[PDB]
From a paper:
Menaquinone, vitamin K2, is a lipid soluble quinone used by bacteria for electron transport. We turn our attention now to MenH, the enzyme which catalyzes the third step in this pathway, a 2,5-elimination of pyruvate from 2-succinyl-5-enolpyruvyl-6-hydroxy-3-cyclohexadiene-1-carboxylate (SEPHCHC) to produce 2-succinyl-6-hydroxy-2,4-cyclohexadiene-1-carboxylate (SHCHC). Rigorous biochemical analysis then proved that MenH is actually responsible for the elimination of the pyruvate side chain (E.C. 4.2.99.20) and that previous studies had been compromised by the inherent reactivity of SEPHCHC, which slowly decomposes to SHCHC and pyruvate. The high-resolution crystal structure of SaMenH, an α/β hydrolase, has been determined and detailed comparisons carried out with proteins of related fold.
The enzyme crystallizes in the monoclinic space group C2 with one molecule in the asymmetric unit and diffraction data to better than 2 Å were measured in-house. At the end of the refinement there was continuous electron density for the entire polypeptide chain, residues 1-266, missing only the Gly-His residues that remain at the N-terminus following proteolytic cleavage of the histidine tag. Approximately 65% of the SaMenH residues are in well-defined elements of secondary structure. These comprise 7 β-strands and 11 α-helices arranged in the α/β hydrolase fold, a central β-sheet with a marked twist, sandwiched between α-helices. Helices α1 and α11 lie in the concave face of the β-sheet and α4 to α8 form an insertion in the canonical α/β hydrolase fold to create a domain that caps the active site. However, in SaMenH the core β-sheet consists of only seven strands due to the absence of the N-terminal strand observed in other family members. SaMenH behaves as a monomer in solution, as indicated by size-exclusion chromatography (data not shown). The residues that form the SaMenH catalytic triad, Ser89, Asp216 and His243 are positioned on one side of a water-filled tunnel formed between the cap and core domains. In SaMenH the main chain amides of Met90 and Phe23 are well placed to form the oxyanion hole; indeed a well-ordered water molecule is observed within hydrogen bonding distance of both nitrogen atoms in addition to the side chain of Ser89. The active site has a pronounced hydrophobic patch created by Trp150, Phe156, Leu153, Leu155 and Phe219, and in addition Phe23 and Leu186 (not shown) help form the base of the site. There are six basic residues in the active site (Arg93, Arg127, Arg134, Arg174, Lys218 and the catalytic His243) and a single acidic residue, Asp131.
Numbering used by the authors: 1 to 266
Amino acid sequence: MTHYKFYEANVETNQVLVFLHGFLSDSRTYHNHIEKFTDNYHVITIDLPGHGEDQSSMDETWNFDYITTLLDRILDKYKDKSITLFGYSMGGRVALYYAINGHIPISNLILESTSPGIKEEANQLERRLVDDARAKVLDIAGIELFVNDWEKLPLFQSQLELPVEIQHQIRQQRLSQSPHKMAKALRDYGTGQMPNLWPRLKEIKVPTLILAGEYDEKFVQIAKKMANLIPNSKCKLISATGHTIHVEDSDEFDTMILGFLKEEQN
């Protein structure tokens, strides 16, 4: 209930494009994009556990297998369609996990500024500690103070250049998240908790589009590495954007998706 929205295509089509959002955000991030795709594609947006309109129980572990089941249940209603699964950042981690472990086969995969998790154990632990600390800060200091600090992360420096409306929308989307739920999201499916999917990338056989922002060096290096390992992948670097490409250059982002979707119609 409430955790996913289906937007009927303006035309008959067997194509369904499924959007997963990032941490501290929800499906509203795709708001201005939906109409660009419904022209030719059915669109689904899904709020992940703890985010936006999600109503996952606080008393269940929101690990990847839980999220996979969640997605299985939605996608089962469209299993006979050609499903393109799109994930941005946190949602891309879910989309990679799902491409590898999901129970409904997807047709195509799209990854924006994401990673298959952390390879080496000590780095996984480093990240767990940080996300665990962050979760504690959320449970205790609340959403506003967290977002204030989150806004200042180097990862998001390129956003400081966005039009004030856009920065407002992003800030509002973050502030509306429940801090206790954000904490649980971090503890249960933060990157530090995610299995290292690097050695399973070769299992992903579907056409895959990988997007990274040129200013976002870390995720560019990750995107290139992922592309090498996913056998039918295209990696596109988006000029003059950081991590959240779909917000910083929405049109180019849209053009890249539509063109990929165009190419893979077969």
